[PDB]
Amino acid sequence: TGLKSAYKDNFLIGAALNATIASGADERLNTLIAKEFNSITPENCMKWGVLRDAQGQWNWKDADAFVAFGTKHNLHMVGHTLVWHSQIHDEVFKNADGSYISKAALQKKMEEHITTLAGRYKGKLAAWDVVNEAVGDDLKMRDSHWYKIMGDDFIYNAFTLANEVDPKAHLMYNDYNIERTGKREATVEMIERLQKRGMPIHGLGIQGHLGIDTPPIAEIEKSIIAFAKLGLRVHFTSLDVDVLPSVWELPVAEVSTRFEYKPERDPYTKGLPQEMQDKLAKRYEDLFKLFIKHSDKIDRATFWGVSDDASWLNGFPIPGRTNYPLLFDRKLQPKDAYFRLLDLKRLEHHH
Ligand SMILES: OC[C@@H]1O[C@@H](O[C@@H]2[C@@H](O)[C@H](O[C@@H]3CO[C@H](O)[C@H](O)[C@H]3O)OC[C@H]2O[C@@H]2OC[C@@H](O)[C@H](O)[C@H]2O)[C@H](O)[C@H]1O
Ligand SMILES: O[C@@H]1[C@@H](O)[C@H](O[C@@H]2CO[C@@H](O[C@@H]3CO[C@@H](O)[C@H](O)[C@H]3O)[C@H](O)[C@H]2O)OC[C@H]1O
Ligand SMILES: [Cl-]
Ligand SMILES: [Cl-]
Ligand SMILES: [Mg+2]
């Protein structure tokens, strides 16, 4: 059978679904998703600035479709995400003149947002990304409007509110690059401190936006172990493997231009060659070997998309590239990596 069956005794296997897919109009994808995945996450439709306009008005069309899709197919559903600094209108935080609103005014908005959104889907969504990406790239607290206005109460209060609204939801903190030394430990320290304040938190989401080479398995392993030691269930939430030339480590002269499209940074428009398919398969295999090793600590592995045509890495960090980050190709056919994942389980040795 599919991935979700192969990995049944280890963890959920999930995918992020965009609004087009979650409409249910695509029979081929409906069939594939039901076969392969037993968890889903909305790619965009539950983000504050997508669900609501700049006047705070709500439009539930896509979010409801997503929840209808998971309900129809009996899929575990992860809400994404209550409190985050991206894809959210500056009007939440600022007067029209640019000045920040008071902490009290912003608290009131958070209360309304969480009570409404988590309330609507209480008991239907099994888990929530309550707060996303609160630690900055510099290892200090991210300098977002949330944080500048509220301090660490923005996190504490978000979890407390979500827990009041749906006491049964598995509440998670989610972030990228927490696979790495530095940001790992900064995140451990932040969560530790909030836990002793009594903040309700059940899970820890490692995004798993990986490169074809970096980070190494050993780093990811340290993170699984460290976050499990906080008494939290570990989830891999946004898995993909970027196979295209990197702009993350370029010379200072290129710091601004590196996000511009250049042909040499987009070398596989005609297809991903077999030798790279091999490397991608081995990279995914390595990763899932690790996950199997620590299956006792891990509740879920969700991929940030189903097939390569829909991946956000086609447009990020450079617009209009042809990337190949996921398990299914642009014709929805399984890639070599998929078969390696299946055989790790098919051929597993037990007594
Ligand atoms: O490029 C087309 C757009 O890409 C897709 O949507 C993007 C999401 O995948 C991405 O999700 C984040 C990935 O990183 C973390 O894991 C984080 O937790 C996720 O939430 O967010 C950005 C989305 O792109 C925006 O989509 C709306 C557009 O108007 C913006 O310009 C984009 O930046 C999706 O296929 C499509 O929207
Ligand atoms: O909007 C968010 C993105 O900004 C975020 O981008 C991540 C930024 O860091 C990238 O990791 C680098 C890979 O290359 C190494 O050499 C560097 O040291 C790493 O920092 C990561 O791949 C990007 O995804 O992703 C999440 C979005 O929400
Ligand atoms: Cl979407
Ligand atoms: Cl090639
Ligand atoms: Mg249900």
Domain residue spans of the chain: 1-351
In contact, 63 and 37? CB cutoff 8 Å: no
Residue 284 and residue 326: Cα distance in Å, rounded? 9
* Backbone φ/ψ region at 124: left (φ over 0), alpha (ψ -120 to 50), beta: alpha
Please state which CATH class domain 1-351 belongs to.
Answer: alpha beta
Residue 58 and residue 257: Cα distance in Å, rounded? 37
Angle at 102 between CA 101 and CA 104, to 5 degrees: 130
Residue 188 and residue 227: Cα distance in Å, rounded? 7
Pocket test for ligand 2, best of 209, 212, 214 (most atoms within 8 A of CB): 209
Q: Is the CB of 2 under 6 A from ligand 2?
A: no
3-state helix, strand, coil in the chain (%, to 5): 40, 20, 40
Query: In Å, how far are 266, 329, 333 from 263, measured between CA atoms?
Result: 5, 22, 27
Residue 127 and residue 7: Cα distance in Å, rounded? 20
Q: Whose CA is nearest to atom 2 of ligand 2?
A: 176
Residue 223 and residue 173: Cα distance in Å, rounded? 14
Residue 40 and residue 33: Cα distance in Å, rounded? 9
Q: Which residues partner with 307 through β-bridges?
A: 328
Torsion of CA 284, 289, 294, 295, to 10 degrees: 80
Q: Which residues partner with 13 through β-bridges?
A: 301
Residue 342 and residue 347: Cα distance in Å, rounded? 9
In contact, 194 and 186? CB cutoff 8 Å: no
Residue 72 and residue 215: Cα distance in Å, rounded? 37
Tell me, in angstroms, the distance from the centre of ligand 3 to residue 251's CA. 34
Determine the atom of ligand 1 nearest the C-alpha atom of 305.
Answer: 9
Query: Cβ neighbours of residue 61 under 8 Å, at least 6 residues apart?
Result: none
Determine the atom of ligand 1 nearest the C-alpha atom of 133.
Answer: 18
| 3-class SS of residue 26 | coil
Q: Is the CB of 11 under 6 A from ligand 2?
A: no
Query: Cβ neighbours of residue 347 under 8 Å, at least 6 residues apart?
Result: none
Helices assigned H by DSSP within 202-250: 217-228
Resolution (A): 1.6
Residue 186 and residue 191: Cα distance in Å, rounded? 9
Q: Which residues partner with 76 through β-bridges?
A: 39
